From a paper:
Here, we present single-crystal X-ray structures of CheY from Pyrococcus horikoshii (PhCheY) in two different crystal forms, and the protein purification, crystallization and X-ray data collection of CheF (PhCheF). CheA autophosphorylates and subsequently donates the phosphate to CheY, yielding phosphorylated CheY. The concentration of CheY-P determines the switching frequency of the flagellum or archaellum, respectively. We observe PhCheY to have a domain-swapped, pseudo-dimeric fold, which may reflect inherent properties of the protein fold but is not likely to be of physiological relevance.
In striking contrast to all of the known CheY structures, PhCheY adopts an open conformation in both crystal forms, with the two subdomains of a given subunit directed away from one another. In both of the two PhCheY structures solved in this study, two polypeptide chains assemble by pairing the N-terminal subdomain of a chain with the C-terminal subdomain of the other chain; i.e. the α3/β4/α4/β5/α5 part of the fold of each subunit packs with the β1/α1/β2/α2 part of the other subunit [Fig. 1(a)]. In the case of the C2 crystal form, there are six molecules in the asymmetric unit. Four of the subunits (A, B, D and F) interact with one another in a dimeric-type domain-swapped assembly. The other two subunits, C and E, interact with their own crystallographic symmetric molecules for the dimeric assembly with swapped domains. Superposition of the N-terminal subdomain among the different subunits A, B, C, D, E and F reveals that the C-terminal domain of subunits B, C, D, E and F undergoes a relative movement of up to 57° with respect to the N-terminal domain. In all cases, the rotational movement of the C-terminal domain was calculated after the initial superposition of the N-terminal domain. The connecting region between the β3–α3 loop is partially disordered for the two subunits C and E. For both crystal forms an unambiguous trace of the electron density in the β3–α3 loop was verified by a feature-enhanced map (FEM; Afonine et al., 2015; shown in Supplementary Fig. S2 for the P2 crystal form). While CheY has been broadly characterized in structure and function, a subdomain swap, as observed in PhCheY, has not been reported before. Therefore, a physiological role for a domain-swapped dimeric PhCheY has to be ruled out.
Residue numbers in the entry:
A (entry chain A), B (entry chain F), E (entry chain F), F (entry chain A), G (entry chain D), H (entry chain B), ...: 2 to 118
C (entry chain C), D (entry chain C), K (entry chain E), L (entry chain E): 2 to 56, 59 to 118
Amino acid sequence: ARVLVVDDAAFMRMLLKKILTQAGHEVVGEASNGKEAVEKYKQLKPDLVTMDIVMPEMDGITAVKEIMKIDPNAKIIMITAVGQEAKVMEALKSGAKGYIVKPFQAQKVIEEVNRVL
Amino acid sequence: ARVLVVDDAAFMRMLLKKILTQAGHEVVGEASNGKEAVEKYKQLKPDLVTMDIVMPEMDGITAVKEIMKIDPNAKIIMITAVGQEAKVMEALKSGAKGYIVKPFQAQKVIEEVNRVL
Amino acid sequence: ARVLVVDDAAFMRMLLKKILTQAGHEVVGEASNGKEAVEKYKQLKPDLVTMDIVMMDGITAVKEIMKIDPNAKIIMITAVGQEAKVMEALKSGAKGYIVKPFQAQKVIEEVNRVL
Amino acid sequence: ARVLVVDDAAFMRMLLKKILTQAGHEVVGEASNGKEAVEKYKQLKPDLVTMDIVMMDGITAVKEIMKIDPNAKIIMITAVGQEAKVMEALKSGAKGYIVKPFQAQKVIEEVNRVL
Amino acid sequence: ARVLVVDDAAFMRMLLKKILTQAGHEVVGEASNGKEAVEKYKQLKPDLVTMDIVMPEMDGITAVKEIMKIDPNAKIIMITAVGQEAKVMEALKSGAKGYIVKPFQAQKVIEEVNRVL
Amino acid sequence: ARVLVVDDAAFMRMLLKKILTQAGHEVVGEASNGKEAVEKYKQLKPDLVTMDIVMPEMDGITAVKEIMKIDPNAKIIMITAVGQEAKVMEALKSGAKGYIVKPFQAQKVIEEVNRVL
Amino acid sequence: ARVLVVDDAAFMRMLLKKILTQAGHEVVGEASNGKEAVEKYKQLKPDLVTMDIVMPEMDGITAVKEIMKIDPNAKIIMITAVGQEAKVMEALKSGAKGYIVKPFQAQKVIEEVNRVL
Amino acid sequence: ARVLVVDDAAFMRMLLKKILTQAGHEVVGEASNGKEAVEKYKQLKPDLVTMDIVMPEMDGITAVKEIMKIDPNAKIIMITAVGQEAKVMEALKSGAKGYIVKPFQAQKVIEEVNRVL
Amino acid sequence: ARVLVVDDAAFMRMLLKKILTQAGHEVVGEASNGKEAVEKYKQLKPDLVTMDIVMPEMDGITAVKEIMKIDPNAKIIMITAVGQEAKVMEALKSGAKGYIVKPFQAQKVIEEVNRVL
Amino acid sequence: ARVLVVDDAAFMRMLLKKILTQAGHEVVGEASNGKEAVEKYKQLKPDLVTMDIVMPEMDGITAVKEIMKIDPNAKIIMITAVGQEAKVMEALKSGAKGYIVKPFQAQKVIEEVNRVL
Amino acid sequence: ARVLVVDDAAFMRMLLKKILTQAGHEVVGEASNGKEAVEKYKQLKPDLVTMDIVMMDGITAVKEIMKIDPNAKIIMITAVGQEAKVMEALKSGAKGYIVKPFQAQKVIEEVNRVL
Amino acid sequence: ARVLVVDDAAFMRMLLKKILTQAGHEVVGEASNGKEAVEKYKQLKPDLVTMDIVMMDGITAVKEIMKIDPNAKIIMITAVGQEAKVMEALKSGAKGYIVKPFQAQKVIEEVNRVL
């Protein structure tokens, strides 16, 4: 069978891939999160999917909060896309120190890195 | 000057890594999701984190539902960890056909793969 | 001579208690399940524990029904903490589950999905 | 729409029956254990079965008590057909067993042997 | 002229076998207990059976009790077949320390041997 | 450890012996019925006993009855020891055709074999 | 006109061979089971194949039984993988004297060969 | 010792043969299935047989499918017994060109051979 | 006067060696773990042994972690038996790239070596 | 490739070494325990490491027992840290003749050496 | 495209066979030594041969050891069919031999005779 | 009583070692070929040596095949350090070589060049 292997841990995808291949199956693709598994399913139409039941769920804001609990002096720069300004605002409130804009202009990224350090 | 780079898109991590390295910084690690960013922060104690504001949020159950919308005959095997049985149950209800237990015992994985196919 | 009596059936605890008391022993406490027996053991330090096992399981019944009728429609009832068994029941052919305590609307929604 | 309701608790069968009937379904039969559900399935050919699983087990409780007190004295209660579980309980540290239905003299003889 | 020889004492079967063979008969099988004599009769359809009137009668439970009288610290592991669980239970009650399951899986046999020792 | 292996089937003693030896244990003796296990325990004082839960229980009379059910024309000669005359009598009643006496005198055994055939 | 004849019954192969030859065809090969038919097809590239739909295939246990009928003193070692213990047990019961485990450890193979001889 | 080596996998026979020969034994023959092992036993009278406990069985239908993969223009006639019709149907669907029932008339066998060519 | 010095700490072996030599003794060998002390005793037959009671012993997983600290691009294949899957999983998580199973099949060892390189 | 082979069993290192060499790889070193594998890695910078996941650990007490089996007149002094007294006691019971606590005075070490000789 | 594969290591023949087959070639035969390769060549007439023969012999080793130590004690380990070589080894200074397959008892008897 | 065990098969060294040790001897070393046995003899000075060397070479096989078929196509499989032998094999008529460890791609490239 043609198998899509889904797990956030690269090494776990590799272990499962080895077992599946030894049993005669072909791993036709891999994914590390939910959204990616859906897209790869559409594209590859595998006979079978294996999926870790823990898929990454933690949003940027929560990650900022957790890092700030571990280290109140942490320095975090957010990357924004357009339309997510509300979330960046909240990330800054929760302790992030700045942000940079995609697509990256190298000079502006570096200027912001220097300001934050 | 020691930087942890966090983004779900590999090519975006590579572009940012190149800019940071050219400017004299050392990229000491990378992460593609929130949970991984937190763990890598604890472990690496970087001077600086760059973090995409959109981190993967889709849980396993939602990924199962979405795959089932695309293909009502999809064959999906969940991987369970201990303590997540409620979520596996719901994944099965939402259309997953079976599950395998970590740590993997190859013979049982294959037996479950064969039952599902 | 100090005895902790464990059985899920109240009347069976009472019958055993009567026999033990007539023979000169003191029933110092009672329990109706394993977890409760452990707690009472810590607390009472009895000389002796009597324990009844409560044992065809649900999973086998699901398998047997599916052998008789491969199109059988079975909905499991679970409470919180029994999810491992429901998982196995679903794997063995059950089509869904409903949660105790029952919320009528959710029971009916699941009944309709399964039919 | 024809439903076989399976649960060891009578009152839970009645609560589910009420909800199913109010939603327009017919409860065509009831059972309190797996074996009985299989027999009733053959006989009634229901469109749908609801089945409650009845699940810390006795063996784990024996193990936990033995961790707390390696000299604990535990006597299992078995009926005919549960011998596999008693065997495992004895292996996990229980010192004996008594048979239901209880014969007072044999219970006391076993209590004395174990003490 | 085709003879099934039944006796619990090997040397008695050998003496009888020698006499029968010298007299021109063919010993087509041997058995050392009752159950074995019945099975060998079905299978061999001998013209004649010789059978010691004392066949072994001691059940497993009695053998456990007798060993325990000789040595109260004896360590005995029962082998169970399916359907004999009541007898194993009673053997454990009478002083046996554990049991192993046929067919033997070597790792589990050894684990049980180690637990008992 | 020093192990006494008890099982009515020779091949099962050999299989268990192989597993025990591979794990480092020494099989110091074997027995095929209950009575023999007790005697060997006394004599060998093993650290450990393995014992099949089904030990032969069927007496001579039952074996005669069972053989006669299988083949009403079966020809069975009993071997008697002194003191077991009641059992031989019952074996004859249940369909055995004769008996021979231990210790064997070859001539008398053969005379009885010829009478019965 | 070049024909491969496939049937598990030798007599049926002989009858078909005779008829085909009398009609002017050349029987270029024969096979008595499926696997053999495939191999002979690759190798001989016949114009035509005749093939029985049912080839009955003798398993290891049956082969042990048949060899033991031919020679009651036969010495047979089974080659097994892990997980086949029920079948090994049955093979031993039917008269096999031992077993060796794949993948092979040469030392253990030889040890088992020596024990059996 | 003189050894008959029985295994369906050629490479496994070769590995066992090498180990046996290095230890000083003589592999006097090989077989790849049960029936062949029996015949070789009769003929060679080996001191010892090594025999894989699982022989894989290719059925007629699979053999037809495999031949058709090797040569899509293969010409196959199912010469079979009555009562197999579902399997013959499937063989015909999988590419077999003909069928006859045994016992047959020579004339009709040849007529079917001619139709198929 | 011929002394074997046993201690896991190199500095402690050096200090003891110096003191023993200054006092007129000859240090004929050193060992840093138990197994090594035994072997060196057999071989050197010293008049005297000094021995630390506690030698801490590094397991496979710790060795993987330590090698990965020294060289983050290290390529490590674990050698495991069946039943150790939890430990292999952890070794892979700690940075090992694969595993091979004892007893060795040479072909699979090489296949895994090639995959990892 | 250049390979470092790590396994506590010499014979297992030799089997793996043979397979690797036959396939064209170079075994550049060997180790029998974790600590030794780390040191050899630093020194050899191999392309690849094969490493048994379980390293067996001989403790000091076992090493004392083993030495005493080899030579019942062995002279062993336990040079140890404070807080180990139960284990030293057992070592003395198992035949060690002396003990000193580290850190020590040279003079007292030598005095204990002299007492034991 | 028809290939004869020659290598003394079975697993190396198998690896090369797999690579050749994946590339579209047919492995028509195998051999593990030179003499066997020649015979298989005659018989199979392959388009192509791959060959890895891996080749100091026992007799030379005996001679060299005897030069180093004229009192050396050497036992040859031989199978049937190698008697000419054993003869020569004994002439060159070896003191005995043991025959494969080994009986432990005969090995020990020969070791004792030679010492 | 101090024994050097010489055999190209690891498992045969191990079997002989076990028998020798059970009989009271000490195996002080092992070797898998002649040259190694000589070196180990010098170094260990054993009381006793057991030796099984098992020895047509590749070059002769090439020559014989070329006599049978002057258009034969032969590829040598070599490791590093055997270049002198490959040279001679090519001179005697072999058309190419492949180097261990194999890369599949290089094997195929060489097979295609030679055909």
